[PDB]
Amino acid sequence: LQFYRNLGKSGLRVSCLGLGTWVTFGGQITDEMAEHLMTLAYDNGINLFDTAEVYAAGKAEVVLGNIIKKKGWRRSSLVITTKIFWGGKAETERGLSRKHIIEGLKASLERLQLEYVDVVFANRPDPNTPMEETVRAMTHVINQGMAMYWGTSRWSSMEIMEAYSVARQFNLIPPICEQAEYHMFQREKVEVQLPELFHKIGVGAMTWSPLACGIVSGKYDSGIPPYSRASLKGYQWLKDKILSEEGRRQQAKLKELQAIAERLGCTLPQLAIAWCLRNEGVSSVLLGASNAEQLMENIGAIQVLPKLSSSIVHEIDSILGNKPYS
Amino acid sequence: LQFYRNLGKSGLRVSCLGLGTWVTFGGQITDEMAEHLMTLAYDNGINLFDTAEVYAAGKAEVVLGNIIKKKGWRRSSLVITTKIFWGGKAETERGLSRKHIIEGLKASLERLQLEYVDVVFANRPDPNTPMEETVRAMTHVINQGMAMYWGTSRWSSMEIMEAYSVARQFNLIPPICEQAEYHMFQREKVEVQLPELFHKIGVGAMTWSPLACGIVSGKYDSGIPPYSRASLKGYQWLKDKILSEEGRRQQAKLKELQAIAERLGCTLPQLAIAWCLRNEGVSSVLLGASNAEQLMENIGAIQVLPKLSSSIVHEIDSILGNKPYS
Amino acid sequence: LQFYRNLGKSGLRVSCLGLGTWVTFGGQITDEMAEHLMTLAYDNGINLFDTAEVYAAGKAEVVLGNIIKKKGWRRSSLVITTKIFWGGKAETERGLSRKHIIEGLKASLERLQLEYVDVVFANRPDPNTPMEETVRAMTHVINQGMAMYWGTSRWSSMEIMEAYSVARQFNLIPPICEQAEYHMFQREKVEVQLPELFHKIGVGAMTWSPLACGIVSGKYDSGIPPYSRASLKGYQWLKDKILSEEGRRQQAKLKELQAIAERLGCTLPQLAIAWCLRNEGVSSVLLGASNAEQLMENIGAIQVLPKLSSSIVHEIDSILGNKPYS
Amino acid sequence: CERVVINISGLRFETQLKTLAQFPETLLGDPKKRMRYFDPLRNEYFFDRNRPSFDAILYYYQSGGRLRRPVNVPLDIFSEEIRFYELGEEAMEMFREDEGYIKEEERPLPENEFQRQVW
Amino acid sequence: CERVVINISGLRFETQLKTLAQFPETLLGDPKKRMRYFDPLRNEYFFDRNRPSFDAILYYYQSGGRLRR
């Protein structure tokens, strides 16, 4: 219904759909495609773009940066996020130490050709760095105006709660967002644990992989298509998931869901993406796309949203059989 | 009596009259007129100049900036204020989010060709942004030395109290000022609610629209003169007020007040402006003027100030009939 | 076992061996040797390089800086430390006053040709400067991003505890590290007092002079070799130690230790350096070397580390006779 | 071990989260129930209630179930607090009988419910 | 709900503003009356008075009118 929404309880307003740059930018797709993909997302009102130092060893950032600079879009109209954790081969080039958060963000910001990102994320938790150091560094880079806000990714509730608690202890800035995985086959965290953090400390969920890497598109029904992600060099891990006992158990479930899709008169991907947004707990879904067809289709998930009755939902829940007890 | 006075309890000293730039600068009047209008106000001791990102879509700021730079006035002799809230058509270009306060003020400051403003205002309250984020952003831009101080505009007492309270909670900077509407037909807030905040937390009132957009000048007695504000493209809202049942009820009251005006040997506008300053609760009145005649006349309100006996006041109160029970 | 380890409990990761620049850089050895010495240490995985404003009156810093800039090593892969206390002949050019910490670090940073060091150290305690001023200055330079972290050198537990305590009092940054002397003939502090601070407030020991200035190499058995440190102009103090009653008492003890060395099939220096790392309380040992032979040998201490059984240790303890009661 | 700040009218109490998890049916033991009193600005649970009582309420959890009325707190007041904090009817009756109030020197079902002949 | 800090000789008390608004004629219930004891630096009302008593005074408001010494 509402295309824009507060990221958690922060005053930051995001389109309910964002465009990511994992696998694709500076990697799988060309820069021409990337530009086209961004221009499309932007012209349809998407203001949220997610990247990371790790993606294509910085190249995703270079490309995203170039597009922004080429199109001459007003910075105030964009919400750019980047994630920090893996920034190089040297020992001190990874993690959430003050040294890496600073050096990492600075390197990212340079590649992006931006003075700041809107949200900077801890890309995963760091058992080797005290919370206090991490929260201080995040608070430092915001105060340096290198970020507007900060967020966590793949942290547990306790980890997020701890970060928040430490911020209140030392009068620092709490995180506003957790970037968590969410699709029909990965629900536990976003559906049980995150809403409690949202109500308690106002942290919002910005979710990733709504098509579970393309799996939910159904395209893997008969195996590994050429030019699919599972087919790419260095995605054997995914190919293995897809062709596993559990991977197949899933594709069987897709066939049933496909029935529900044709009934609402939409594609399966649209249903799945729309399914992720079905609850106000989720602030935005980060899309992935290797072409303009995939993206324009995915944007269509929004039209599906009011078609998701509580009965269509209970129906999907039955076929999936993976609704987590709260 | 005292031409300069502390803005609230801050150490900032303002002329009891300021010159605004709403409607006029970069809009209704020419840049030559604007320059002349500023030079006049300045040479008569006015140090207070109010603008906003919203005004003439930034053009008021461009013009005010040019004048300052042309006349080569010493920055330390000027008190420049700007308001932030509506800064563009994109979703993230409005409100009091950290992102917009920073990007908004920065854009303003660029247009103005200044390194800082003296006071930055929340142009209205923002229900979509937590107080903490707003107070932090305001405190951030002051620490960046982009503003000397910050203020609220059109906030309620509770909203101002909340901002103050949050500042004390997190050891941030409380606001020093509320920019509120005040004229003979709009008294409630400035006369009841604001003095309590002044005595309690030292917030001062810097009031706007002392002539209720020109209405109090009496010039609308027989209708809509050509080249009056109500006549301008995009001020139908005002034309409608003026020609309403209540709008007319008022103009009838002006005719009576006009008697009191000729008795003190001053114009009606001078009485009204002087009437706003009659209480030490009001720190400054922001004037509007489309010509030098209007401005030089309005500055004359000061001579009227000692002529305002408690009996002249009780008299005005009777004819108006709108004195708010405290 | 583990070549990299957290410096104390900070997220900063250091090679268990670092290379210092005392006596050698810009002093005893040539810049060609210095470069070669650094390139060697670096290519063997050492990321830790220690210097000080005092060393060769700034010249050690100039040389270390040049090498870094010549080799074009990525800053994020290096951990540069410098110590501050003695920065010149004028009264205000020494100590831990806000003035000197700032001016001192800034001067160092300029010489180094770096925007920041990773850790800045109080080079010794300052009885003439209140703790609060020192902790504030250290916290200031970190916030200015001139250092990532700060540490103490030659402070007592109480002094370190006091610095920590003051940081918590005023919400500042506690120190992460004490740079203390540690070798077979100087054990008391690192073995008794520092582990308590590590467990309590997470301060790590980065130790210096593992060969007690070359003494532990055994090279002084028959006196003062030419081109040895004790032979250098301005190291009479050391020559005197070496040829003292106690200095000789020690060299006799080296001869016994040499037996243990040939039994483990390593040199004496390797045993001593490895001996310093034997306990997880020690985060890194800062090496000194006047040639590439001395350095490549010293790096070999790591191979000796698993050969240090609790019985080899009790054996060394007996011959030394200086194990401190805890 | 994560810790919890409970603010009873300005009087700050601190305990461990597991100390409270020891009685999951009580208000403070139940996340959904206490969620309503959480102040995100201060990271504490605020209760606009009786100060002298809470001492014992918190000690109940720490002691693993001891519930004694502080000698300076009236009977009717302290009882109301037990009721608010939802300590449970078991803990409540143990308190009732420890406080010095006996209602059942009885055989449970005889005196009250009795006779099966409606007549 | 806006909250109020009452400082009785260093002993900090906290209540809701509506809890006090329940008795508008009393000193603490009356904005004009308590205004005199407000500390803008600390955002609290300071009273240089008896500590052991206030406990009951505040409970009076919370209990809706119970006043026990």
Ligand SMILES: NC(=O)c1ccc[n+]([C@@H]2O[C@H](COP(=O)([O-])OP(=O)(O)OC[C@H]3O[C@@H](n4cnc5c(N)ncnc54)[C@H](OP(=O)(O)O)[C@@H]3O)[C@@H](O)[C@H]2O)c1
């Ligand atoms: N916070 C984190 O740790 C984290 C982790 C991962 C990702 N992310 C972010 O989240 C974003 C999510 O991206 P994702 O890769 O996970 O997205 P996804 O929705 O799970 O999958 C997108 C991929 O599936 C295929 N696909 C997309 N739309 C399709 C359609 N309509 N029909 C058929 N196939 C379609 C596409 O190309 P193919 O042809 O190659 O299959 C695309 O690359 C990333 O870009 C990244 O920014 C964050």
Ligand SMILES: NC(=O)c1ccc[n+]([C@@H]2O[C@H](COP(=O)([O-])OP(=O)(O)OC[C@H]3O[C@@H](n4cnc5c(N)ncnc54)[C@H](OP(=O)(O)O)[C@@H]3O)[C@@H](O)[C@H]2O)c1
């Ligand atoms: N904080 C806020 O949300 C807020 C809101 C509004 C304004 N403000 C500020 O406050 C300032 C107040 O300006 P205003 O427009 O409200 O002022 P005003 O005093 O209510 O009216 C000024 C207008 O009335 C007419 N007028 C002025 N003097 C006159 C005179 N002596 N005789 C006859 N007509 C006269 C003028 O031109 P015409 O010929 O066109 O009538 C002028 O444009 C603004 O410039 C702005 O900076 C702040």
Ligand SMILES: NC(=O)c1ccc[n+]([C@@H]2O[C@H](COP(=O)([O-])OP(=O)(O)OC[C@H]3O[C@@H](n4cnc5c(N)ncnc54)[C@H](OP(=O)(O)O)[C@@H]3O)[C@@H](O)[C@H]2O)c1
């Ligand atoms: N925090 C502080 O107050 C403090 C104080 C002192 C030092 N430090 C730091 O710690 C570092 C430790 O250096 P150090 O001078 O104390 O080191 P050391 O290990 O005690 O001695 C190194 C010196 O002994 C000789 N040597 C080194 N390896 C040898 C080997 N394998 N065989 C025979 N001789 C060998 C070398 O040259 P020669 O031929 O000239 O003997 C070298 O200059 C310094 O560079 C400095 O950065 C800190």
